[PDB]
């Protein structure tokens, strides 16, 4: 209906991040190698310090957002359902799982 296998989901996420990235590129347009040693086969690839910092910031930011949204579902989740008796939080959470099982 319904669930999605772990592949299709992976693809969808890939596309989503592609769009986000392309938006960084457009907004950046609006505001405006391979060396392998002979001694060892160790490969080295020249890097732009920019876009690496931007990458780290992107990952951290998205992690923050996910953590926060899940946290809001934490908050509402416990405050919404007051019907049945409960001894502790963990009980109420379990019985909401029983609401998911219906």
């Amino acid at each position: 209906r319904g669930g999605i296998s772990y592949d299709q989901l992976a693809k969808l996420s890939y596309e989503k991040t592609l769009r986000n990235l392309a938006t960084q590129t457009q907004n950046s347009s609006k505001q405006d190698k391979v060396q392998k040693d002979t001694k060892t086969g160790k490969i080295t690839i020249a890097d732009d310090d920019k876009l690496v910092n931007k990458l780290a910031v992107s990952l951290q930011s998205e992690s923050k957002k996910r953590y926060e949204a899940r946290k809001r579902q934490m908050q509402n989740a416990k405050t919404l359902y007051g019907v049945e008796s409960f001894i502790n939080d963990k009980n109420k959470q379990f019985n909401e799982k029983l609401s998911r099982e219906s």
Partner: protein, 48 residues
Amino acid sequence: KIPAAVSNWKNPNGYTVALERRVENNTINDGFMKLSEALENADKKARQ
């Protein structure tokens, strides 16, 4: 999808769950009809 496992016998943690998580068709046979009728009638006959 596997449902949750809820037993009458044990709730070690203390999860409190609704009574309906804790909480026949076939009717009689015509043999009962026959038997009751036979005792009924033979009883009447004897008494008479």
